[PDB]
Design a protein around this ligand. Structure first.
Ligand code: CHL
Ligand code: CLA
Ligand code: CLA
Ligand code: CLA
Ligand code: CLA
Ligand code: CLA
Ligand code: CLA
Ligand code: CLA
Ligand code: LUT
Ligand code: BCR
Lengths: 154, 49, 93, 49, 215, 49, 144, 498
């Protein structure tokens, strides 16, 4: 981690090979180990609802990108089962890769995509930066906020 | 009088035999384990200096 | 055919079934090809996905940049910045 | 013979430890100590048998 | 919040056997597999409704056991792990005893337990089999759904994983399917003159023929 | 009860599994289940009896 | 001595005239295969077992898996070649001519099977392997 | 007719040269373009392996010969066989996955991805080079990219590690160049550097021994051989984990590939002379690194010493003159490329959250981070030579190759077989201890570490996609061996009497 204040140095030595957990006499058995901490509940959600929630939480591709990402692997498996020529499979895989990457390039940029200096500026200024970067052309952005990327200026 | 002829004949000896796990395992800690630990450090020393 | 019965005196007889089977090189190439396309599909899909930690404020806010040495450099930077802040405060006063 | 008798004895001991864990806690230093464990014939008869 | 061990009646807008129709007033969704199907009004009397529910449960369980004991050995014979299995001819085989004395022994043994079940239905709690351990409290079971140590050694009822109503409708639905299946097998064994899986094999191939209309 | 049922089954196993190595209801020349199972078996001490 | 100094020894020539007449050796032999030294009884047991192993090779014969047929044939052929040499060299003098004739026929069948595999001809491979199969059955019947 | 291998070599570096035409900021467009190039190249190698590589052919395939310099008789010559296609596919797979795992990099993303594509091109050019000087050039072409990656995206001691790495590699590679000059000038009429015509060359014993030493010093600097291994612990410990994939999965195998292609194939007599002394060195390397690993408090240093230990089985399979030993060496190359890269990746991703180095202070990580615990345990089991994984079958085949070897007689065959056995007693001793000091026990963690702290979909996919071939090869090893059973036999065909 990071300390804003110089930490107290370790006066007493510690065994290298010892386990780094708490002492066995300080261990709250049944709670620290999850052995008696699961009490059931009538309020259990649907299995397929949980599947859908977990899939949607990953932020899947949507639309044509979602369609091709869903239909790529079954199409490849069917083409290999039906003994269709493999050159068509390679053409389809390359087209899928290029289309997916181009679509992902077309997607708007987020604050986490930039340098830590850009991430850790004023939040309003950062919001204006992100709003402009996804709106105007890259040349106008570079001629307007270019000097913000000279990290030695400040 | 807690007769000492009986106390150390079995009770002390049997309890120490059962509690110390027959003294083999501690020997395995004293001879092998720690020794191999030292050996590791020694090898690391020869790889560092 | 591919079945051998051996009798041993004083022992139970044994019936051995054998089948010398191996995958063709075409099947191995198919396995390699499908794994390559699976790798490409997964790279695309799970690059398009969101990253719970590396996009979070817990990582980027502390100064993380995907670089393996940002923690030590950030620590030395904040000590140097504290000393420079003391120098600034003594200059102003 | 020993596998079945051993499974029986181990499962009985586990059920008895589970029974004792409600009165001594979930610590195995307390819930597996036969010193504090007497007089369970009246409480767990099936496990006793 | 915890595990509810009571059956929850279905709402009055539950799916019915004949959608768009009015469910009968004596079928309020409190029974397992309640779909409002009573054209003849046989369940109008609540006492006869309880008796018919218990009879349906018994027929369901016996039919599921019956169809399992027909299909699984037949599936083993087709695989080849049974030499001469035939459920139609199974009753006329040679065993260690005559069918009549076996029937009498079965009658006595089964009329013990069927009669203990009768006493439980007439007087709930009069016969208890679950042990009365010194501080364990035995929950009161429903009539027709008993089970502590013996009949419910899994504790899958009483609100565990699926609520009691859900599992009871599952049981009743599988039971109805098994009753229909067993009656179908009984008619097929005398109509087609063949086995169940063989009939399925000749029906899956060219289903336009090899049907009820071609013996 | 889910803990108790395997205990009952293992009680039955413990009571009635010793009869697979001993002859069950011996009437004259009768070999037990285990020796008929292991009909070719090494027996150095009793190779003649 | 700890290790060999020069190049590793190659295919040791058989002293029972079971090789090819023109060359003195068989084509299916592979150098570098470790043969365990057991003796005449162990060589006979391995001969019968590996004849059964080669008669387990019906499934491997196909348009796509002829290379594995050739590999298994070379491996087992070297093994049974040297086991046959060992058992003929320790056979009684009256039994040496029939054993040598059987070995010669079996190794000619091996060469024909390898030749059929090389041209990637499947019916020829099947016919040559059928002749090899009857010869291998004769081998196990002799050496049981 | 089409230059497949030339296109495969040229495409990544040529595409990465155009990464500076992008005026975009951030890393999104740069990383997506780089992964597009990597996946297109991977599909290209897949097409080449599927349609133009024949595993039953022991000869060179897809050869391309273009004369570049007349004075050295030096040709851009490319060609693949059963020996090279495995490392080529592994290089493509690991480099694409390392590009995917290097996505949080926001500082100098353009240069980072350009160097990644340059490393791609250089490794592929090495693994498919049929010219000695071209081999040397592709060998040298990675000193600068790895140096920049270390010095700009490494750890605390990255600069000293980078300096030590580049100086050690240059010190080995000058001996490599001297060996190249000696072999390529032995021709009585004109100099020649093609490996095909050099495989039939006959040398005197002393000159062959000198050339073998000149090549072996370089191949012992690169592939870690005691005591030329000291660059590896600080180089791999203080490097980026994405770069650690290439360092411990691809670049380490290049020394072994050079040992097979040059020392084992071109100079068989000197290799037969040197191999029994290589066996003892490999066994002592296994024991020495497996004993150095418990002495390392740093996690990444322990993993690096584990890699040094695992290289000993490759050395043994090289020195044991059998087809089985060489097959086991190739299988261990693939297995270690699948295991060490994933272990380094998991270590780096875990450090990105825990931000701790020494093992004696990282208890209880299994509570906030269970999935990375599962992956770390599985890849440790793969490191442990556990059956169902590629490591066990690789070590077993190496053992069989030693047992079936005809060069050694009895007692050394015992004292080496016992030797590596001690290694697979020492390999658990630290590894599980590592896990016991990194995941076991209880520590009170922050509430913010309860969510958005474990490995995401990308890291899970990377670990799963490297773990699946491990299981697939541990179940059916002939998914790899069948690619190189023929060519290895040809390599062995020169070691017997003729
Ligand atoms: C309770 C349901 C029950 C049912 C549905 C059947 C059904 C059938 N039995 Mg079985 N049996 C049943 C119970 C019993 N049977 C037998 C003993 C026999 C005999 C001895 C025979 C049958 C036969 C038959 C077939 C009559 C035509 C028919 C498949 C006949 C057959 O051969 O067809 C399979 C036959 O001869 N059953 C006994 C012992 C008395 C039973 C006791 O519960
Ligand atoms: C419960 C489901 C059920 C199923 C899956 C089958 C299955 C089969 N039967 Mg059997 N059968 C059943 C019940 C069932 N039967 C009943 C209740 C009876 C009479 C009381 C019969 C009497 C019978 C005869 C006389 C014959 C078959 C034959 C066959 C085949 C169909 C072709 C046909 O002509 O028969 C249709 C016959 C009927 C009398 C229709 C009964 C349908 C009942 C009333 C309802 C089933 C519907 C419901 C949606 C089931 C779900 C389907 C699926 C999800 C399980 C097929 C293998 C034929 C055979 O195999 O010839 C080669 C044939 O000869 N069956
Ligand atoms: C127990 C016997 C049973 C019976 C006799 C019926 C009878 C009927 N059902 Mg009901 N149904 C039942 C149980 C039953 N259902 C159950 C358990 C459910 C689940 C809740 C339903 C749910 C249901 C739905 C969703 C539908 C029907 C439909 C139908 C009708 C169409 C069948 C037909 O004409 O084709 C003859 C078929 C042959 C194979 C010959 C028929 C009157 C349909 C409806 O009522 O309108 C048409 C329909 O859409 N039923
Ligand atoms: C074994 C006998 C049996 C019995 C006693 C019951 C009993 C009951 N059923 Mg169930 N049921 C059965 C089998 C049976 N069912 C089968 C096979 C099916 C699938 C077709 C269903 C499907 C079903 C539905 C969809 C519903 C019920 C419901 C009911 C309840 C109210 C209706 C009633 O009063 O029943 C009185 C019943 C009897 C006394 C039986 C009389 C039958 C006559 C005398 C002759 C039998 C007919 C003929 C031989 C059929 C041959 C097979 C056919 C394919 C040719 C009651 C608990 C309702 C409910 O609320 O669930 C609890 C409801 O909605 N049942
Ligand atoms: C031997 C004596 C015996 C006795 C006294 C009973 C008694 C009973 N049976 Mg049982 N039963 C028996 C043998 C016996 N059963 C056998 C051998 C079987 C196997 C087929 C069954 C399977 C069975 C079913 C499937 C049903 C009963 C039902 C009943 C009840 C109906 C009362 C009656 O019809 O008179 C009663 C509790 C009915 C029920 O429980 O209604 C509530 C019911 O549906 N019994
Ligand atoms: C619903 C009740 C039920 C009933 C009445 C029967 C009845 C019968 N079974 Mg079936 N069976 C059932 C369910 C049932 N089975 C189930 C759930 C299975 C498991 C899949 C089987 C599997 C089965 C097999 C494997 C065999 C029978 C056979 C038999 C017959 C005599 C064996 C026996 O009962 O004494 C045995 C009693 C013991 C307690 C021991 C008899 C027709 C035998 C047969 O077909 O006769 C030739 C036989 O081989 N059954
Ligand atoms: C076909 C499905 C089925 C279903 C869903 C139910 C559902 C219900 N039953 Mg009913 N029951 C059935 C068939 C079924 N039953 C049969 C055939 C009988 C006659 C034996 C009974 C008689 C019965 C009794 C006597 C009791 C119940 C109870 C219950 C509850 C327990 C949950 C359950 O059974 O597990 C759902 C899952 C399964 C049924 C899976 C099928 C089992 C497979 C085929 C075999 C079991 C595996 C293996 C061989 C067993 C372990 C081996 C061990 C002995 C060594 C639930 C409400 C209990 C009750 O209501 O108390 C509240 C009660 O004690 N049932
Ligand atoms: C056409 C659509 C359809 C749909 C949506 C359903 C839906 C459902 N079925 Mg039904 N079912 C159907 C047709 C259908 N069924 C048919 C054709 C049959 C054969 C007669 C059945 C027989 C059936 C059985 C035997 C069971 C279900 C069960 C279930 C439920 C459990 C879901 C699982 O998971 C679910 C509500 C389960 C249930 O709830 O009953 C206990 C169950 O065990 N269904
Ligand atoms: C007819 C025909 C004809 C043609 O030919 C062919 C075809 C088509 C194939 C056919 C058809 C068929 C069908 C459909 C059938 C169905 C069936 C069923 C449903 C069954 C169940 C069945 C079912 C069953 C057995 C079940 C059973 C159960 C049980 C025992 C249980 C137990 C238990 C309990 C209670 C409780 C606890 O806690 C647990 C336990 C212990 C676990
Ligand atoms: C050499 C090579 C390769 C290849 C490979 C292969 C050939 C593979 C295969 C594979 C296969 C053919 C496989 C099969 C199967 C598998 C399976 C069946 C699995 C399963 C699993 C599971 C289910 C789970 C798991 C897990 C995880 C993921 C992690 C954690 C732990 C656990 C274990 C839980 C590549 C291309 C890469 C490239 C480079 C070179």
């Amino acid at each position: 981690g990071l300390t804003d204040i110089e930490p107290d140095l370790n006066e007493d030595p510690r065994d290298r090979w010892a386990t780094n957990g708490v002492a066995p006499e300080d261990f709250v058995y049944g709670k620290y180990d999850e052995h008696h901490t699961f009490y059931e509940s009538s309020e259990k959600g649907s299995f397929w609802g949980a599947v859908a929630e977990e899939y949607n939480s990953m932020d899947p591709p949507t639309g044509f990108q979602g369609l091709i990402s869903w239909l790529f692997l079954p199409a490849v498996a069917a083409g290999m089962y039906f003994n269709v020529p493999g050159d068509y499979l390679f053409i389809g895989a390359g087209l899928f890769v290029i289309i997916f990457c181009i679509i992902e390039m077309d997607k708007p940029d987020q604050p986490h995509n930039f340098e830590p200096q850009i991430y850790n500026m004023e939040r309003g200024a950062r919001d204006k930066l992100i709003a402009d970067y996804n709106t105007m052309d890259i040349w106008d952005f570079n001629e307007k906020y270019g000097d913000l990327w000279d990290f030695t200026l400040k | 009088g807690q007769k000492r002829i009986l106390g150390d004949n079995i009770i002390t000896i049997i309890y120490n035999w059962s509690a110390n796990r027959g003294y083999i395992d501690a020997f395995y800690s004293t001879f092998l384990i720690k020794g191999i630990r030292s050996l590791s450090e020694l090898v690391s020393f020869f790889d560092r200096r | 055919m591919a079945v051998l019965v051996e009798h041993v005196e004083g022992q139970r007889d044994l019936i051995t079934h054998k089948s010398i089977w191996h995958l063709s090189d075409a099947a191995i190439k198919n396995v390699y090809l499908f794994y390559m396309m699976f790798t490409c599909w997964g790279c695309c899909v799970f690059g398009a996905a969101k990253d719970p930690y590396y996009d979070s404020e817990q990582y980027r806010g502390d100064g993380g940049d995907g670089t393996g040495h940002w923690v030590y450099e950030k620590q030395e930077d904040i000590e140097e910045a504290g000393r420079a802040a003391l120098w600034r405060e003594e200059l102003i006063e | 013979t020993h596998a079945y008798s051993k499974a029986l004895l181990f499962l009985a001991s586990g059920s008895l430890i589970h029974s004792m864990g409600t009165i001594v806690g979930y610590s195995p230093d307390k819930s597996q100590n036969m010193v504090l464990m007497g007089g369970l014939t009246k409480h767990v008869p099936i496990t006793k048998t | 919040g915890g595990i509810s061990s009571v059956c929850e009646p279905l709402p009055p807008d539950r799916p019915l056997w004949f959608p768009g129709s009015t469910p009968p007033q004596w079928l309020d969704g409190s029974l397992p597999g309640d779909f409002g199907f009573d054209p003849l009004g046989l369940g109008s009397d609540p006492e006869t409704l309880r008796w018919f529910a218990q009879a349906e449960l018994m027929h369901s369980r016996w039919a599921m056991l019956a169809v399992a004991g027909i299909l699984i050995p037949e599936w083993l014979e087709s695989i080849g792990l049974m030499e001469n299995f035939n459920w139609y001819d199974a009753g006329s085989r040679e065993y260690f005893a005559d069918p009549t004395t076996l029937f009498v022994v079965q009658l006595a043994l089964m009329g013990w337990v069927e009669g203990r079940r009768w006493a439980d239905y007439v007087n709930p709690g009069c016969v208890d089999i679950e042990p009365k351990l010194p501080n364990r409290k035995n929950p009161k079971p429903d009539v027709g759904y008993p089970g502590g140590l013996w009949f419910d050694f899994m504790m899958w009822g009483r609100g565990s994983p699926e609520p009691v109503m859900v599992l009871r409708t599952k049981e009743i639905k599988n039971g109805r399917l098994a009753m229909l299946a067993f009656v179908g097998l009984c008619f097929q064994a005398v109509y087609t003159g063949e086995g169940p899986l063989e009939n399925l094999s000749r029906h899956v191939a060219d289903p336009g023929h090899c049907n009820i209309f071609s013996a | 009860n889910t803990m108790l049922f395997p205990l009952i089954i293992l009680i039955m196993f413990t009571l009635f599994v010793g009869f697979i190595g001993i002859p069950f209801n011996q009437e004259g020349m009768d070999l037990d289940i285990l020796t008929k199972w292991l009909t070719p078996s090494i027996n150095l001490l009793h190779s003649n009896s | 001595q700890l290790w060999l100094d020069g190049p590793l020894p190659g295919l040791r020539p058989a002293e029972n005239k079971i090789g090819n007449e023109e060359t003195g050796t068989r084509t299916f032999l592979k150098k570098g295969i470790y043969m365990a030294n057991i003796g005449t009884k162990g060589s006979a047991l391995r001969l019968r077992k590996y004849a059964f192993d080669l008669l387990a090779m019906e499934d491997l014969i196909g348009q796509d898996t002829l290379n594995y047929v050739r590999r298994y044939l070379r491996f087992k052929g070297t093994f049974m070649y040297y086991d046959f040499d060992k058992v003929i060299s320790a056979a009684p003098v009256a039994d040496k001519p029939p054993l040598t004739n059987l070995a010669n026929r079996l190794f000619d069948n091996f060469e024909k099977l390898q030749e059929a595999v090389k041209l990637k001809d499947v019916p020829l491979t099947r016919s040559c392997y059928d002749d090899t199969a009857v010869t291998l059955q004769e081998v196990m019947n002799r050496m049981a | 007719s089409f230059p497949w291998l030339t296109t495969i070599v040229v495409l990544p570096i040529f595409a990465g040269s155009l990464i500076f035409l992008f005026p975009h900021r951030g890393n999104k467009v740069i990383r997506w373009y780089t992964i597009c190039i990597s996946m297109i190249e991977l599909l290209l190698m897949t097409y080449v392996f599927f349609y133009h590589f024949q595993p039953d052919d022991p000869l060179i395939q897809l050869v391309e010969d273009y004369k570049w310099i007349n004075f050295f008789d030096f040709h851009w010559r490319l060609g693949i066989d059963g020996l090279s296609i495995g490392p080529i596919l592994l290089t493509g797979f690991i480099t694409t996955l390392a590009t995917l795992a290097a996505w949080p990099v926001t500082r100098n993303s353009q240069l980072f991805h350009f160097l990644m594509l340059a490393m791609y091109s250089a490794q592929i050019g090495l693994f498919s080079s049929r010219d000695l000087l071209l081999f040397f050039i592709m060998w040298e072409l990675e000193l600068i990219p790895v140096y920049l990656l270390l010095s700009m995206w490494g750890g605390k001691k990255r600069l000293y590690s980078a300096t030590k790495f580049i100086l050690y590699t240059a010190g080995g590679s000058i001996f490599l160049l001297m060996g190249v000059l000696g072999v390529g000038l032995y021709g009585s009429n004109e100099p020649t550097l093609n490996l095909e015509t050099l495989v039939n060359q006959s040398y005197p014993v002393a000159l062959e021994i000198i050339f073998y030493i000149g090549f072996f010093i370089a191949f012992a600097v690169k592939l870690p051989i005691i005591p030329l291994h000291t660059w590896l612990p600080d180089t791999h410990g203080e490097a980026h984990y994405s770069t650690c994939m290439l360092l411990a999965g691809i670049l380490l195998k290049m020394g072994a590939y050079g040992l097979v292609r040059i020392n084992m194939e071109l100079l068989p007599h000197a290799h037969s002379i040197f191999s029994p002394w290589l066996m003892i060195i490999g066994t002592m390397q296994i024991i020495y690194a497996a004993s150095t690993s418990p002495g390392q408090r740093n996690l990444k240093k322990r993993i690096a010493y584990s890699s040094v230990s695992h290289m000993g089985f490759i050395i043994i399979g090289i020195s044991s003159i059998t087809d089985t030993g060489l097959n086991g060496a190739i299988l261990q190359i693939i297995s270690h490329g699948f295991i060490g890269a994933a272990l380094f990746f998991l270590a780096g991703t875990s450090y990105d959250r825990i931000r701790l180095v020494y093992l004696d202070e990282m208890g209880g990580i299994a509570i906030p981070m269970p999935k990375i615990f599962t992956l770390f345990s599985s890849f440790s089991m793969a490191s442990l030579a556990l059956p169902g994984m590629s490591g066990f079958i690789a070590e077993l085949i190496v053992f069989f190759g030693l047992i079936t070897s005809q060069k050694y007689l009895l007692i050394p065959k015992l004292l080496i077989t016992f030797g590596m056995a001690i290694g697979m007693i020492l390999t658990p001793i630290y590894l599980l201890s590592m896990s016991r000091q990194m995941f076991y026990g209880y520590k009170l963690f922050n509430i913010s570490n309860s969510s958005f702290f474990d490995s995401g979909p990308r890291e899970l996919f990377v670990s799963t996609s490297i773990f699946l071939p491990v299981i697939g090869i541990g179940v059916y090893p002939d998914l790899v061996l069948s690619l190189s059973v023929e060519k290895v036999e040809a390599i062995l065909s020169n070691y017997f009497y003729r």
